[PDB]
């Protein structure tokens, strides 16, 4: 982390340089391992780094110092992965999740099931981690949470029996994506690696995904190689990226398998699978990984918005209180930080640099306070005014929400300031309009008028541009 500062540390004057570099190199290089300490690797990176230099230059029209970076960043992905895709599915798919004990296989299976169910696929989760007795209940529970059926293939006397029951269940329930969660095993455990190979020959899986923990060290190389040579494995999932491990194990695994890193496991939540690839680490690693984030901004916003799936709610109809909708975005804008919040203040904030979620838990508490308000107060052109004229109302809201009188006046003051950027012009009213007749539909409107014909990547781009509640301000400033 504090090397990620070497970044801006470091950007400053350009009166000095190569030294700046090698230090930074070594500096960065220090904060890691470094070469020869836990492995061996690094020499390689710190090499390849060099290699380039004495073979290149920043295309003119661009300060070197920067370039260096693209390369740094660039080698960093290179050392813990570089990614684009995603898997190509067919009519019928059967995948295995494999790896060391504790890498995150069972959770990843559930994540994959949720991810693809949303894509319209029939998933079936197969709990075949028999050694751990508690293990079947674990996936069973996850299955319930994501609503993906779960077969506990606990007739292990022959793989053949497992195949039989999986086939029967997939047919009767029209399953088209079978995810086989296997028990964790050491890459050197002959009996268990042999069992995995056997299971593979019987089940005829398309994809064999090695689930690798982002914190994995020097042995990532041998682990990836062993699983690859014994069970043919193509493709990887890098888990626990929501931690602060650098993730170099990804580069090690990529280098010896030549199989692309399909997905990134971020958090422990069922929907925290994504996709980003090496770009975000690159971004990671830099101070822009609150630029890169605002992928998350976009990517996960189109989420808004389609068919009102958002449960009508979200920013949508809840969008009336806009104020209610702004609270959801701030809710999902917590949620969790894409970039640094420009915010417009400092006043103690006392570091106040970050907590998520804690930031999202705050929006939720404000929502519970507005849950005590009524339609008149919620749809009022100026809800703060309705309480200035009838202060008795403040007392009721506070009673119902288990909050104090001051807390409600605070919410009201915050709403006032919110409605004012929102007001920043024109405020609430022009944003609501546009906002009640537009917002999504008022990017939707736009979505419907300037989609059509755009592929899905194109529509997400457009949705991010919308997003913008000043893109209109950008466009008019442009003019």
């Amino acid at each position: 982390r504090k090397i990620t500062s070497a970044l801006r540390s470091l950007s400053n004057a350009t009166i000095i340089n190569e030294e700046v570099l090698n230090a930074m190199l070594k500096e960065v290089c220090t904060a890691l391992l470094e070469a020869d300490v836990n492995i061996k690797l690094v020499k390689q990176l710190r090499e390849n780094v060099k290699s380039a230099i004495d073979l290149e230059e920043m295309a003119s029209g661009l300060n070197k110092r920067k370039m260096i970076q693209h390369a740094v960043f660039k080698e960093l992905v290179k050392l813990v992965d570089p990614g684009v895709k995603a898997w190509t599915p067919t009519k019928g798919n059967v995948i295995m999740f494999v790896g060391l004990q504790g890498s995150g296989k069972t959770t990843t299976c559930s994540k994959l099931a949720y991810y693809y169910q949303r894509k319209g696929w029939k998933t079936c989760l197969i709990c075949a981690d028999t050694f751990r007795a508690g293990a079947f209940d674990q996936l069973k529970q996850n299955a319930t949470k994501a609503r993906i059926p779960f077969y506990g293939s606990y007739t292990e006397m022959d793989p053949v029996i497992i195949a039989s029951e999986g086939v029967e269940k997939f047919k009767n329930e029209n399953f088209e994506i079978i995810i086989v969660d296997t028990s964790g095993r050491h890459k050197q455990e002959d009996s268990l690696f042999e069992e995995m190979l056997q299971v593979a020959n019987a089940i005829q899986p398309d994809n064999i995904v090695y689930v690798m923990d982002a914190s994995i060290g020097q042995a990532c190389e041998a682990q990836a190689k062993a699983f690859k040579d014994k069970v043919d494995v193509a493709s990887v999932i890098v888990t626990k990226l929501d931690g602060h491990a650098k993730g170099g194990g990804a580069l090690s695994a990529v280098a010896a398998t030549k199989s692309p890193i399909i997905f990134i496991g971020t958090g422990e939540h069922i929907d925290d699978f994504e996709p980003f690839k090496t770009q975000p680490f690159i971004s990671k690693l830099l101070g822009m990984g609150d630029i890169e984030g605002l992928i998350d901004k976009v990517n996960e916003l189109k989420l808004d918005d389609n068919e009102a799936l958002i449960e009508k709610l979200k920013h949508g109809q809840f969008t009336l209180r806009d104020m209610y909708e702004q609270f959801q975005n701030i809710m999902k804008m917590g949620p969790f930080s894409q970039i640094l919040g420009m915010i417009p203040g400092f006043g103690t904030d006392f570091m106040s640099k970050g907590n998520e979620q804690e930031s999202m838990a705050r929006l939720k508490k404000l929502m519970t306070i507005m849950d005590s308000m009524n339609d008149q107060e919620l749809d009022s052109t100026d809800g703060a005014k309705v309480f200035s004229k009838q202060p008795g109302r403040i007392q009721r809201v506070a009673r119902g929400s288990g909050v104090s009188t001051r807390d409600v006046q605070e919410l009201l003051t915050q709403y006032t300031k919110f409605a004012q950027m929102v007001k920043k012009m024109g405020g609430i009213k022009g944003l609501f309009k546009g906002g009640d007749m537009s917002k999504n539909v008022s990017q939707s409107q736009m979505a419907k008028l300037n989609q059509q014909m755009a592929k899905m990547m194109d529509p997400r781009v457009l949705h991010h541009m919308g997003g913008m509640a000043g893109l209109q301000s950008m466009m008019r400033q442009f003019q």
Partner: peptide, 17 residues
């Protein structure tokens, strides 16, 4: 829009203990 609105929302929550 997303910047201030989100940043003011952010700056407010931190400041108000």
């Amino acid at each position: 829009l997303g910047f201030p609105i989100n940043f003011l929302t952010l700056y407010v929550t931190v400041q108000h203990k």
